[PDB]
Design a protein around this ligand. Structure first.
Ligand SMILES: O=C1CCSCc2ccc(cc2)CSC/C=C/CNC(=O)[C@H]2CCCN(C2)C(=O)[C@H](Cc2ccc(Cl)cc2)N1
Ligand SMILES: *[C@@H]1O[C@H](CO)[C@@H](O[C@@H]2O[C@H](CO)[C@@H](O)[C@H](O)[C@H]2NC(C)=O)[C@H](O)[C@H]1NC(C)=O
Lengths: 253, 28
């Protein structure tokens, strides 16, 4: 998260860290949507052009709080599910993946799932100028001279970003964007700033329903041409537009 | 899940995180 700030303890208890097992390395963000189900970006797991191809056994996830007793929870994955029509070849359309835990996770003060939206919620929020929240352990700067400058965070970072109108999204980039993704961030005019960055991919874009005070995951941190560049915006997988596929996977397995 | 998106250390205790009002204020 570029230009964000430190999250408080328990502020984002659906947060999940995706780790490669060997060598141990933070890879991506994720979100807890049930006791056994975890949501992430497909490109975290599968990007052939870069030789990224992981299977359940290559990965573990980390959930909960990160002297103090270590209350963080490590778990393995049963199965990965990349969307069948995930377009890694062209534009990262349908950038979504599901991961089932080997054994279910026990909720606590630090571990709790986030709501997936329904038609009314997605339509009612998820409009331009409305702000969502992004969280991750990804980099603080797009580039940094190693050993002279801080780039990786010590606590979970948070930033609130406004959804951008689709026409502004389309015009900001040469990438062919689809109804399966939206963009967020401040315009150069707007004074404020902030963005996702490398390592924030797969984590959640959440909004608080004023109607029931619950947090909904509206987006998944997907892609961006840089981090926090003027005139440019981060793109998010449109979760509701892909909910039918989320249902299909959970209800069948 | 029936209790999803309600955070034990915030909504369940009637506490607000530092920056959430900024989200609500954006809906106005
Ligand atoms: O897309 C990424 C990460 C995916 S990288 C694999 C990839 C997939 C598809 C493609 C190109 C590359 C081509 S189609 C989709 C377009 C992706 C554009 N992007 C790049 O080219 C990156 C190149 C590497 C540096 N770089 C930029 C990054 O590190 C960031 C990190 C980041 C993530 C999320 C947000 Cl919200 C903001 C920033 N942007
Ligand atoms: C990335 O994942 C694996 C590489 O481990 C590829 O899967 C292999 O081929 C078929 C594809 O249908 C699988 O069912 C097999 O289980 C895999 N073979 C072995 C030796 O285990 C997979 O297809 C790759 N994905 C892409 C898009 O190339």
């Amino acid at each position: 998260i570029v230009e964000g700030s430190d999250a408080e303890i328990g502020m984002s208890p659906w947060q999940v860290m995706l780790f490669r097992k060997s060598p141990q390395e933070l890879l991506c963000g994720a979100s807890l949507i049930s006791d056994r189900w975890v949501l992430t970006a497909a490109h975290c797991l599968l990007y052939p052009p870069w030789d990224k191809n992981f299977t359940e056994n290559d990965l573990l996830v980390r959930i909960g709080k990160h002297y103090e007793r270590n209350i963080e929870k490590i778990s393995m994955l049963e199965k990965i599910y990349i969307h069948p029509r995930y377009n890694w070849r062209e534009n990262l359309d349908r950038d979504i993946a599901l991961m089932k835990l080997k054994k279910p996770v026990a909720f606590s003060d630090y571990i709790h799932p986030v709501c997936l939206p329904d038609r009314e919620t997605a339509a009612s929020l998820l409009q331009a100028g409305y702000k969502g929240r992004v969280t991750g352990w990804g980099n603080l700067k797009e580039t940094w001279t190693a050993n002279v400058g801080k780039g990786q965070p010590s606590v979970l970072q948070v930033v609130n970003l406004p959804i951008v109108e689709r026409p502004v999204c389309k015009d900001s980039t040469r990438i062919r964007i689809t109804d399966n993704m939206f963009c967020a961030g401040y315009k150069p005019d707007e004074g404020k700033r902030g963005d996702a960055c490398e390592g924030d991919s797969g984590g959640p874009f959440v909004m608080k329903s004023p109607f029931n005070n619950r947090w909904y995951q509206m987006g998944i941190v997907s892609w961006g041409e840089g981090c926090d560049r003027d005139g440019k915006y981060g793109f998010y997988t449109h979760v509701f537009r892909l909910k039918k596929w989320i249902q299909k996977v959970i209800d069948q397995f | 899940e029936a209790d999803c998106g309600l955070r034990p250390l915030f909504e369940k205790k009637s506490l607000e995180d530092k920056t959430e009002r900024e989200l609500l204020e954006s809906y106005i």
